[PDB]
Subunit: 144 residues, 3 copies
Amino acid sequence: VSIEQSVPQAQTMLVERHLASLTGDEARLLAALSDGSAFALLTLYSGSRFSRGEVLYRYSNAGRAAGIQCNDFIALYLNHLFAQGLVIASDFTESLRTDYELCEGDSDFRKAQAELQIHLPKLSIRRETLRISPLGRQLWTLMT
Amino acid sequence: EQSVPQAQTMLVERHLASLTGDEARLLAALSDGSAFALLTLYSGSRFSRGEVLYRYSNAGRAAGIQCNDFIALYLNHLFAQGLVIASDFTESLRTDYELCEGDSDFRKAQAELQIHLPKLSIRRETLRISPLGRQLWTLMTT
Amino acid sequence: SVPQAQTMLVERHLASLTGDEARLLAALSDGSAFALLTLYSGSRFSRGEVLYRYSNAGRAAGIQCNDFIALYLNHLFAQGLVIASDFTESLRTDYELCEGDSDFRKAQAELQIHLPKLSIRRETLRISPLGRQLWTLMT
């Protein structure tokens, strides 16, 4: 028998694996989403608005309010938060119009879009809304 | 500089090392060839499903799950790690899909999601080990 | 001085990216494009999600263990570091070759049992903007 050091509970493993493993910037983004706040999201889809196909790239200005260190990595951060099931995308929010415009004007986003258009000629921007997912909320609650 | 044995160890580690007891047991069951009921919530309707928003299974004791509270989290992880697939509806899982659809946690997740995604749809699916899951299992058991 | 946030991100990948995946990213970062076969769900009521991907980038990319190509592709796509574009006429022979490879046909046969409308898409593997950015950070 060897139990002096404790094997962690499922709960603990879940929060270590999905939240403690986040980079500080990712964690700050999730924090900003945790009270239900919604942010502007631009999603690049492989096809046009009459046949969207798959999600290729995501961009937001939520990093600014969230206080992230390196806003240059926002698309990388969002890819991870989505891949991990921690956030969701929903439809356009009229009140975020100004934010979409700020995002669409960003030079890094425009660069990414131009790279993707070379080979995906029908690529389209879709204005969406970023929120915490049920799974992200469940994990957040376990952690707190 | 990385050797082949180190690549293999890194692959096994990165996909399999963080599993809970429940997940390790479920994956073992799936590696035997067993399949279980899966209920998936999609952001769009049946002709344009969009993105996966939530997955639920009543796998329970038969799959070795102690903590039914975390089944959506476990499925989320196992899919993210490429370890499992969702195949089509299986008739023989009929009564399990009914159990899933009745479940309280499932229904709550659905209602939350519906607030902001009103075209949301439910699909009955079948959870099985993926080809990558099978390869990794074998690499791991060497 | 490198920003903290950059170090954290780079370290994540240094701990999880294999030599072979690193070499594959590098080949792609040059602008190289490879044959990709994608098995996906062919039911009109599914999202048509990817079930398996295969390529013969192989020696071209400097892959030491071609046994692991499907695992590498799964990881590179999950991490958003590569994209799949349309069929490239130039790669026709490569597509024919991939379609006949053992590992591909085995995965295909496994999946076919349970996914009778299993479909195959011939596509082209390229780096994504995220892949360019990360690979630049890491190098």
